[PDB]
JSON list of C-alpha atoms in Angstrom, two decimals:
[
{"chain": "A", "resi": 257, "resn": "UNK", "atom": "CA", "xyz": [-18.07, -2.51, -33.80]},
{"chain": "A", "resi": 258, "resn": "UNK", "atom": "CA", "xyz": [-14.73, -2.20, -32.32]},
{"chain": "A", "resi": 259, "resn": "UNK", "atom": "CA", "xyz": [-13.23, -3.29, -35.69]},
{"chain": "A", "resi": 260, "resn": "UNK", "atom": "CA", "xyz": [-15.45, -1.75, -37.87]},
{"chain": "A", "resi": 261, "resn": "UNK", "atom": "CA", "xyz": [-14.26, 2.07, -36.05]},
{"chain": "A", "resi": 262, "resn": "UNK", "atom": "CA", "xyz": [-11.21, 1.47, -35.41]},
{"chain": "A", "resi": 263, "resn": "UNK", "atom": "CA", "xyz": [-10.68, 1.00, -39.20]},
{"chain": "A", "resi": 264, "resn": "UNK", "atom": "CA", "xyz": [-13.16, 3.35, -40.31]},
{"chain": "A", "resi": 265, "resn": "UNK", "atom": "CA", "xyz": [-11.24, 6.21, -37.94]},
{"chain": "A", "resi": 266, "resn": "UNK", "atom": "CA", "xyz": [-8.00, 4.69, -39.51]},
{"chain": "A", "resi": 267, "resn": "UNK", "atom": "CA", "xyz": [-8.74, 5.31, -42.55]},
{"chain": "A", "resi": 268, "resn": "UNK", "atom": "CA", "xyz": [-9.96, 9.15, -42.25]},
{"chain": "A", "resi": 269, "resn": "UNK", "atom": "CA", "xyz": [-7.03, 9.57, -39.79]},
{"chain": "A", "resi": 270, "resn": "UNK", "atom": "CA", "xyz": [-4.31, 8.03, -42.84]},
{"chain": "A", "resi": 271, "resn": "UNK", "atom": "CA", "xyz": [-6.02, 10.45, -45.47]},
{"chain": "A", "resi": 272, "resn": "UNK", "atom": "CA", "xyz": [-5.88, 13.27, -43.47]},
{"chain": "A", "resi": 273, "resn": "UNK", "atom": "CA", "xyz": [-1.78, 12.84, -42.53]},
{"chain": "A", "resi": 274, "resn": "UNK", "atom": "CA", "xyz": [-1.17, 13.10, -46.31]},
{"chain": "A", "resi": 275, "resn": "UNK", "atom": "CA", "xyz": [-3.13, 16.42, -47.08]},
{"chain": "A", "resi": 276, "resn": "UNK", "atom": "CA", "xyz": [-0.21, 18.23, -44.73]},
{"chain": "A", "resi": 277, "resn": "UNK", "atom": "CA", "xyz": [2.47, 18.03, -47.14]},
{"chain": "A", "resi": 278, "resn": "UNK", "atom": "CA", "xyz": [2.40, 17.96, -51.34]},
{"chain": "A", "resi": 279, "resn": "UNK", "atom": "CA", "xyz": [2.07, 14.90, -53.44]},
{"chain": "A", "resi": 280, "resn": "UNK", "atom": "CA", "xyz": [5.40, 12.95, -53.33]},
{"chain": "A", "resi": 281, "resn": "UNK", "atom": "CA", "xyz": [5.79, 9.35, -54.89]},
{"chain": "A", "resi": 282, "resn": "UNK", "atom": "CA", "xyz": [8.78, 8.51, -51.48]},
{"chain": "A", "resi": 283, "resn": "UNK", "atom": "CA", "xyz": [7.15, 7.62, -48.34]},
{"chain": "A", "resi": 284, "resn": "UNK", "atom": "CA", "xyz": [7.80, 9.64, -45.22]},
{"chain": "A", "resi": 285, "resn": "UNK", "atom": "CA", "xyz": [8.03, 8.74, -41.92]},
{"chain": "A", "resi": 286, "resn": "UNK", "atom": "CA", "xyz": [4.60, 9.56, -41.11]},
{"chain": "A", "resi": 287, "resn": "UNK", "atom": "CA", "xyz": [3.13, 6.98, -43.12]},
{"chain": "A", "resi": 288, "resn": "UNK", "atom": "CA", "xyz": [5.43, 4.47, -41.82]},
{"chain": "A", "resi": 289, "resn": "UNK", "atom": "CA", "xyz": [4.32, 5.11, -38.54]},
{"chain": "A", "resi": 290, "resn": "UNK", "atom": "CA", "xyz": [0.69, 4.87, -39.51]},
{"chain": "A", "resi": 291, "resn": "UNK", "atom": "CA", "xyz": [0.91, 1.42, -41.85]},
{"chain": "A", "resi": 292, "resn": "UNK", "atom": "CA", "xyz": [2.69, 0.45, -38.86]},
{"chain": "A", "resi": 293, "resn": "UNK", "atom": "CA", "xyz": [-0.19, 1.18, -36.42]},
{"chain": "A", "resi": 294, "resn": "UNK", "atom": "CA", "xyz": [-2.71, 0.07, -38.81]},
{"chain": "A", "resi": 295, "resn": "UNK", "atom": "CA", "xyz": [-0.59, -3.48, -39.36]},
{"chain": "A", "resi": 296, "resn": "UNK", "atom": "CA", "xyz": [-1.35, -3.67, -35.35]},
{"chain": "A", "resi": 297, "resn": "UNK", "atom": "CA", "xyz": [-4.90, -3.27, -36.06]},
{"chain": "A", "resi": 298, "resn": "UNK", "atom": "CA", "xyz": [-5.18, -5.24, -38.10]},
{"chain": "A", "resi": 299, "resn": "UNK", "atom": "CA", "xyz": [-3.14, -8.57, -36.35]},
{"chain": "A", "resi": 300, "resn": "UNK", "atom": "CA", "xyz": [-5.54, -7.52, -33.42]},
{"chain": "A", "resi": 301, "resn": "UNK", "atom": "CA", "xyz": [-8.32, -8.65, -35.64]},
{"chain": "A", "resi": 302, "resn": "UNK", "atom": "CA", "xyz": [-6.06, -11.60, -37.01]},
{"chain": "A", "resi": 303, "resn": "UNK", "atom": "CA", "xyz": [-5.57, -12.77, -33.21]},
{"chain": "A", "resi": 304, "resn": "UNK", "atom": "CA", "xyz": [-9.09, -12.12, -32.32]},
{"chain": "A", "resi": 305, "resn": "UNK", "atom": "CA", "xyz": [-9.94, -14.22, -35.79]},
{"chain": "A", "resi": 306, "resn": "UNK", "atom": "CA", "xyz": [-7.47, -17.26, -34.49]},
{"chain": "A", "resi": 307, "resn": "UNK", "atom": "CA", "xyz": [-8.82, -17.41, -30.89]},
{"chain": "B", "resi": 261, "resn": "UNK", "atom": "CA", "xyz": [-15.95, 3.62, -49.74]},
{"chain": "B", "resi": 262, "resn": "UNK", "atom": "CA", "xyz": [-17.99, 6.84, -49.92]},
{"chain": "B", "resi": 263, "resn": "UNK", "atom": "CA", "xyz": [-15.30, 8.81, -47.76]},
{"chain": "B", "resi": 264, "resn": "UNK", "atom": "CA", "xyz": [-12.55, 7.74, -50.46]},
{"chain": "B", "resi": 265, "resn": "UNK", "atom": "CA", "xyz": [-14.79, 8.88, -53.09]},
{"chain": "B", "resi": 266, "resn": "UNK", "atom": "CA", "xyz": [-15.32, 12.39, -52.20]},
{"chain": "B", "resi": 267, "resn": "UNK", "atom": "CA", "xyz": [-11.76, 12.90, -51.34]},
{"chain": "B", "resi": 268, "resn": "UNK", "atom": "CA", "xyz": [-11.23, 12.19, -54.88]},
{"chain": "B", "resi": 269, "resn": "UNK", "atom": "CA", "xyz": [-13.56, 14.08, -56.02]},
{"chain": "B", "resi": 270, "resn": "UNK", "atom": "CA", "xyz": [-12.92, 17.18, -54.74]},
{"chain": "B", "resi": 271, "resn": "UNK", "atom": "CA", "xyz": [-9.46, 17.08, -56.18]},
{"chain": "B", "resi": 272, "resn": "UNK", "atom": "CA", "xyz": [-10.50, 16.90, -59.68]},
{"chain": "B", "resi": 273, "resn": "UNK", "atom": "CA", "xyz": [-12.46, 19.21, -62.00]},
{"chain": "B", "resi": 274, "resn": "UNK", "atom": "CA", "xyz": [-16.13, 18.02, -63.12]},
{"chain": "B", "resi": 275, "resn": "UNK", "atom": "CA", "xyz": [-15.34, 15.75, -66.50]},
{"chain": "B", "resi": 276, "resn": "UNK", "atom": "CA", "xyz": [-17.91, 13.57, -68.25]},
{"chain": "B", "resi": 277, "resn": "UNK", "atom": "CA", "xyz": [-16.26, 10.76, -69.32]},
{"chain": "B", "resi": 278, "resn": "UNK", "atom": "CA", "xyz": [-15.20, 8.15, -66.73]},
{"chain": "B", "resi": 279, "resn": "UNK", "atom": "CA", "xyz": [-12.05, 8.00, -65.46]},
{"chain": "B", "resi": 280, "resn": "UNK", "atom": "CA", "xyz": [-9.75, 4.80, -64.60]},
{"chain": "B", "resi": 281, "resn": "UNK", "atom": "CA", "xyz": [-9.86, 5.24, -61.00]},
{"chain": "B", "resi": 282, "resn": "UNK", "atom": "CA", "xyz": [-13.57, 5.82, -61.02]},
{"chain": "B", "resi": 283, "resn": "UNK", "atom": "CA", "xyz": [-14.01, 2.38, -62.70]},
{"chain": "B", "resi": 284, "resn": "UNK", "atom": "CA", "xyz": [-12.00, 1.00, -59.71]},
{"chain": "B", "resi": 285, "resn": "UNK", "atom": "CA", "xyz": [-13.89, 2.44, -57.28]},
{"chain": "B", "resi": 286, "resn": "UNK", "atom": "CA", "xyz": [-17.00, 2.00, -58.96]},
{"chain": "B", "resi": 287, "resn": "UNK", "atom": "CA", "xyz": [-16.08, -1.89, -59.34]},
{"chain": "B", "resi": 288, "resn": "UNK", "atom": "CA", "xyz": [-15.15, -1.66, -55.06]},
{"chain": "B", "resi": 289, "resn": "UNK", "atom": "CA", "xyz": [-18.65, -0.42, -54.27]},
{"chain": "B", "resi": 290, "resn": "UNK", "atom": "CA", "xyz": [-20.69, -2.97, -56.30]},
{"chain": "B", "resi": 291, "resn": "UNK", "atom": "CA", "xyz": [-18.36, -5.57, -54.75]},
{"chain": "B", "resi": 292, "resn": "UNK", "atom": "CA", "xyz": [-19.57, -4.28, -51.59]},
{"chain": "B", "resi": 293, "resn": "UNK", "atom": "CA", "xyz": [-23.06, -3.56, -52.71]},
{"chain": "B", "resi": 294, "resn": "UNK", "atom": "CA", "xyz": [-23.06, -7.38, -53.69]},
{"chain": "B", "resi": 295, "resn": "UNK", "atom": "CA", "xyz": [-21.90, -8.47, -50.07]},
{"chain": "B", "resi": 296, "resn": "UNK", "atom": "CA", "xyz": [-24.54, -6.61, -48.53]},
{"chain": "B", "resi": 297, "resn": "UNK", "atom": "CA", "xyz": [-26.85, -8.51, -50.56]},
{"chain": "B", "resi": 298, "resn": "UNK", "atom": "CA", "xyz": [-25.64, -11.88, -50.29]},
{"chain": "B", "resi": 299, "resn": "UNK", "atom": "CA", "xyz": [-26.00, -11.76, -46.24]},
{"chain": "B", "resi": 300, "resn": "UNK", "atom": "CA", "xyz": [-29.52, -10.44, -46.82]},
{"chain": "B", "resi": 301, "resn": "UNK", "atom": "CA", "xyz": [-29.98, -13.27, -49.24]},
{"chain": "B", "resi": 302, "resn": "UNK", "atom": "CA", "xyz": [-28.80, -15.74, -46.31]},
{"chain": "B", "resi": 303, "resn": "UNK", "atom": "CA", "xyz": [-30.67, -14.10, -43.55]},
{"chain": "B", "resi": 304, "resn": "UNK", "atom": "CA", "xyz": [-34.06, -14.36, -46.07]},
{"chain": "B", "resi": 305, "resn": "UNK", "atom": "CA", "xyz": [-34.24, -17.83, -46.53]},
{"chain": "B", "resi": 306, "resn": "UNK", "atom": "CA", "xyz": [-32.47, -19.18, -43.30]},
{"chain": "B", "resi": 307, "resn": "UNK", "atom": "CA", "xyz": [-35.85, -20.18, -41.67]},
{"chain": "B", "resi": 308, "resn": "UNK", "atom": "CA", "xyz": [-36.36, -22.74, -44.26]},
{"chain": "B", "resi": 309, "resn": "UNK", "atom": "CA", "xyz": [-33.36, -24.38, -45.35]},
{"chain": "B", "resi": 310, "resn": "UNK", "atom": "CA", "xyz": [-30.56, -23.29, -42.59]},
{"chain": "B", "resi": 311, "resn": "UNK", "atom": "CA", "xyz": [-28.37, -25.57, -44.56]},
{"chain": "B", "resi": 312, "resn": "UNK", "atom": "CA", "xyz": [-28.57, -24.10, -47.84]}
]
């Protein structure tokens, strides 16, 4: 359950930061910062997966 | 999958024809829909052959 919210909320949270500013192909540092945070979630479930 | 969907949708104006991104998404949720079924599939016949 953990994973399944945490991904779920990530999701709705990562379309929501790119309704703030027009459609651009570049990526700005807002969705850096979020890939980045969702790459931790993500190796959270990869550790939880190797233990 | 359903989320994605209407955020799409609401985008776009109401054509008939289907798009290329719709067939994507379409193809996501039957690979889901298919998941769903397999574990139901395992969980139906586990009492008799656990193996299989």
């Amino acid at each position: 359950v953990f994973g399944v919210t945490t991904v779920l909320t990530m999701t709705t949270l990562s379309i929501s930061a790119r309704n703030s500013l027009p459609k651009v192909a570049y990526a700005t540092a807002m969705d850096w910062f979020i890939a980045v945070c969702y790459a931790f979630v993500f190796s959270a479930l990869i550790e939880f997966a190797t233990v | 999958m359903t989320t994605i969907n209407t955020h799409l949708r609401e985008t776009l104006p109401k054509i008939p024809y289907v798009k290329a991104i719709d067939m994507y998404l379409m193809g996501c949720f039957v690979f889901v829909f298919m998941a769903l079924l397999e574990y139901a599939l395992v969980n139906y016949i586990f009492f008799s052959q656990p193996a299989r």
